Amino acid sequence: PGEPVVGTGASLSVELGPRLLTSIYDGIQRPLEVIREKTGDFIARGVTAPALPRDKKWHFIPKAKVGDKVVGGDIIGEVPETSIIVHKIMVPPGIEGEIVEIAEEGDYTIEEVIAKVKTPSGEIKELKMYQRWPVRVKRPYKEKLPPEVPLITGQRVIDTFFPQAKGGTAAIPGPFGSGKTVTQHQLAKWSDAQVVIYIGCGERGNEMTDVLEEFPKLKDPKTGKPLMERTVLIANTSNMPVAAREASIYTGITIAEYFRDMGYDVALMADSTSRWAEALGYPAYLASKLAEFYERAGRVVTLGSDYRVGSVSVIGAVSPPGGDFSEPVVQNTLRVVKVFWALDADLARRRHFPAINWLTSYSLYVDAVKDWWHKNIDPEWKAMRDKAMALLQKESELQEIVRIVGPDALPERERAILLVARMLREDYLQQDAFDEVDTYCPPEKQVTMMRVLLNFYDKTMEAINRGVPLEEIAKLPVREEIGRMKFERDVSKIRSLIDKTNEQFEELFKKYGA
C-alpha cells in the first residue's frame, strides 16, 4: 500500500527488476493467489501482496565505472536471472549524470543501492536493480521504427502469407485455452522473441489448472530449458475484481516495454473471453482506449547512449460474445490491428491444420517485410507468395463454379490448377505441429519448399500446353516426394526435388514427342 494522489491515478504502478521472469501475477502485479479491489476513472486502492522478492540474492556484474556519463536507459550492470535470460540493469528514464558510486561484482538483494548518479544540478540519485513505472504511461524511447523485420514464427502460412512484423499488432480468434487449435501455443514457443509476456484471461474450471502446473513442465524448444524461464505470466481468473482484469494488459504491456528497453524482442500475448471487461459517448471511448493500448506496440530505438533496438509485438485473442464476430469487441480490434489470422471452425473440422482461412486472413505487413526476405533469404520471396496466393484465389473461384455446374466439363488446364492448388494446400499450408521436424519451418526451408511447388506449377502448365494428359502429371512419382518434403530436415534434399521434377517431366515430354 502506497501514497494517495489526485488525477487519473493513485499512481498505479509496477516494479521491474530481477524475478519478473517465471513469475505469476494478477492485473496489478501481485503474486500467485492474491485478492480483491475496485475501480476508478481517477483513483484505486489495494490490500496485502508484494511483487518482486526482497529476500532473494542476485549476482550483479557491473558494466559501468565511476566517472562514466550516463542517461536514462543506459546499462550499468548485468544480472543472470534464469538459464535463458540475462537481466540488464538500466538507469531509469529521466535520470542523467555522472556515476559517482557503483557496486562491485557480488551478490545483492533488490533494495540494495548498486549505483549513485550525480545529476547536472548536483543532486545524488540512488539506483537499485529494479525501478517503478506507471502502467498507464507509455514507457519512453528515442524513435519508433517503421515495420521492417518479420517476427519469424516458423509457421508457413503465417510467415509467408500473413506475416507479423516485430513491433506489429495481430489478432486471432480466442480463447487461447481452446483445444481446437494449437497455433496459439506454436506462436508462444517458436516466435523469435527472447521474452514472452502472456495474459491468460477468463480461465475457468481447469483453464487455471492448465496454466497452473503444466507451464512449469513446458520446454522452450530452442534451449531445452523451461519456457517459464523466458516468460512472465499474468492471470485473469473469473474470481478476480474487474478492475485488476482491466488493468492487466497495461501491466503486461509495461513489463513488455521494459524488456524491449534492454534490447530484447518481446511478444505480448493477450487472451480474451466472453466480454473480459465492464470497468475502466461510452461505446466509442472504449474503442479509443484500446487503440492506445495497441499503439504501444512497436520496434524502437531505445533510450541509452548506445544505439539499441528492441520491440513489443502484440498478439491479441478475439472472442466475441455470441461467436458472432460482428460484435463490437472484434470490429473494434480489427480496426487497429494490422494482422488477422482467421482460425476457421470449418478448416478444423476437415483437419486442415493450422486452421487458418487463407481467404479471410490478412496482413498489412507484406510490403514492410519483403525486403528483409529478399536480402536475407530469397530475392523472389514476394513474387512467389503472390503467385501462390493468386493460385489459391483461382482455386476458390473454380470451386464456386464447380459447386453450381459440377466437375465433368473442366478443361485439362483448370484441372491442373486444381491439382497444383491442392498440392499447395496439402504440402505447404498444412503443417504438423506434433512432428519433430515440421513443428518449426525455418525461413530457408520455407522458400525452398515454395520454389519446388511453383516450379511444379510452371512445369505442369507447360506440359499441358504441349498436350501431356493431366492424369500422367497427377501420378508423376516426384509428387509423392513433394508431399513429404515438410518432413525432411535437410534443405538441400528438398532443393534437389527441383531437378528431379524437371527430369521426370522431360521423361514425359519424350514419352509424348512433339
Curated annotation (Swiss-Prot):
Keyword Nuclease attributed: yes
Cross-referenced Gene3D superfamilies: 2.40.30.20, 2.40.50.100, Bovine Mitochondrial F1-atpase, Atp Synthase Beta Chain, Chain D, domain 3, Hedgehog/Intein (Hint) domain, Homing endonucleases, P-loop containing nucleotide triphosphate hydrolases
Function: Component of the A-type ATP synthase that produces ATP from ADP in the presence of a proton gradient across the membrane. The A chain is the catalytic subunit.
Classification via InterPro entries: ATP-synt_VA_C, ATP-synth_a_Xtn, ATP_synth_asu-like_sf, ATPase_a/bsu_AS, ATPase_F1/V1/A1_a/bsu_N, ATPase_F1/V1/A1_a/bsu_N_sf, ATPase_F1/V1/A1_a/bsu_nucl-bd, ATPase_F1/V1_b/a_C
Posttranslational modification: This protein undergoes a protein self splicing that involves a post-translational excision of the VDE intervening region (intein) followed by peptide ligation.
GO cellular component terms, semicolon-separated: plasma membrane
Xref: SMART domains: HintC, HintN
Additional note from the record: The intein interrupts the ATP-binding site.
Keyword flag Kinase: no
Subunit structure: Has multiple subunits with at least A(3), B(3), C, D, E, F, H, I and proteolipid K(x).
GO MF, one annotated term: proton-transporting ATP synthase activity, rotational mechanism
Family: Belongs to the ATPase alpha/beta chains family.
Protein name, UniProt field: A-type ATP synthase subunit A
Biological processes per GO annotation: intein-mediated protein splicing; intron homing; proton motive force-driven plasma membrane ATP synthesis
Catalytic activity, reaction form: ATP + H2O + 4 H(+)(in) = ADP + phosphate + 5 H(+)(out)
Pfam families: ATP-synt_ab (PF00006), ATP-synt_ab_N (PF02874), ATP-synt_ab_Xtn (PF16886), ATP-synt_VA_C (PF22919), Intein_splicing (PF14890)
Alphabetical keyword list: ATP synthesis, ATP-binding, Autocatalytic cleavage, Cell membrane, Endonuclease, Hydrogen ion transport, Hydrolase, Intron homing, Ion transport, Membrane, Nuclease, Nucleotide-binding, Protein splicing, Translocase, Transport
Record-linked HAMAP family: ATP_synth_A_arch
